[PDB]
Amino acid sequence: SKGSRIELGDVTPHNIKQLKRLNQVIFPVSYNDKFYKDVLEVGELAKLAYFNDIAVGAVCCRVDHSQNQKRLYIMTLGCLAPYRRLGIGTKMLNHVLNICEKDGTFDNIYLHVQISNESAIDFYRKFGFEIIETKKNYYKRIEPADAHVLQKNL
Ligand SMILES: CC(=O)SCCNC(=O)CCNC(=O)[C@H](O)C(C)(C)COP(=O)(O)OP(=O)(O)OC[C@H]1O[C@@H](n2cnc3c(N)ncnc32)[C@H](O)[C@H]1OP(=O)(O)O
């Protein structure tokens, strides 16, 4: 961290419009107004990422109680294409993993990744996520429609 050009910051009503703007560019699906209202209620489970003080990415997660487990679902985690491979993803993912580790009550953390997304698959597998399922027809309008479920056991 010493001398890093990357910092995470809180999401607030002042910068929620910035988060939406980033999400629009980065992710191929659009999120509704309820999504953005919810982000304001999850505390440290949502953050904006800054590179040299410029907002370039974001992470939004929620707690999911399914399969009789307590799970952390990564709804969105990403940064703008020109700033990729600079460790921003790592900073965001490590933040969420540290929240789970300090809580200690999570069974697993998981997300969906479109099957064509090789760089996301490489990235999550680096952190010990495993492809546990491939969901056919996960997306309704984009191609390929299929998504891998990537899960890390905690
Ligand atoms: C519709 C969907 O599928 S959404 C769910 C997936 N997320 C996205 O598609 C959002 C768009 N993508 C991104 O924002 C990025 O590509 C991310 C979040 C996946 C990775 O973020 P980055 O900031 O680029 O990752 P970071 O620089 O921390 O990468 C760390 C590690 O990941 C691995 N990695 C990351 N990107 C790549 C790549 N393109 N190719 C191979 N390995 C990669 C590397 O092993 C390793 O780092 P190093 O080899 O550079 O030391």
CATH of the domain at 147: 3.40.630.30
Q: Find the DSSP H helices in the chain.
A: 16-26, 33-39, 88-103, 118-126
Distance between alpha carbon 46 and the CA centroid of its chain, in Å?
9
Task: Give the closest residue (by CA) to ligand 1 atom 40.
Answer: 119
Q: How far is the CA of 115 from the centre of ligand 1 (A)?
A: 14
3-class DSSP state for residue 60? strand
Burial class (CB in 10 A: 0-12, 13-18, 19+), 73: middle
Experimental technique, in short, is X-ray
Return d(Cα 136, Cα 53) in angstroms, integer.
39
Resolution attained, angstroms:
1.8
By residue range, what is the domain housing residue 36? 1-154
Please count the structural domains in the chain. 1
Q: Is the dihedral of CA 128, 131, 133, 139 positive or negative?
A: positive
Structure tokens at 141: 């309008």
Ligand 1: lining residues by beta carbon, under 6 Å:
26-28, 77-79, 84-90, 113-114, 117, 119-120, 122-123, 126
Structure tokens at 78: 């990403």
Question: Could you tell me if 131 and 152 are in contact, meaning their C-beta atoms sit under 8 angstroms apart?
Answer: no
Pairing of strands 108-114, 69-79: parallel
3-class DSSP state for residue 80? coil
Residues involved in catalysis: 73, 112
3-class DSSP state for residue 32? coil
20-25 contact pairs (CB < 8 A, 24+) = 22/48, 22/55, 22/56, 22/57, 22/58, 22/79, 22/80, 23/58, 23/76, 25/80
- Count the Cβ atoms, other than its own, within 10 Å of residue 80: 16
Q: Which residue in the block uniquely carries the two structure tokens 């910035």? A: 18
Q: How far is the CA of 104 from the centre of ligand 1 (A)?
A: 26
Distance between alpha carbon 82 and the CA centroid of its chain, in Å?
18
Return d(Cα 56, Cα 26) in angstroms, integer.
10
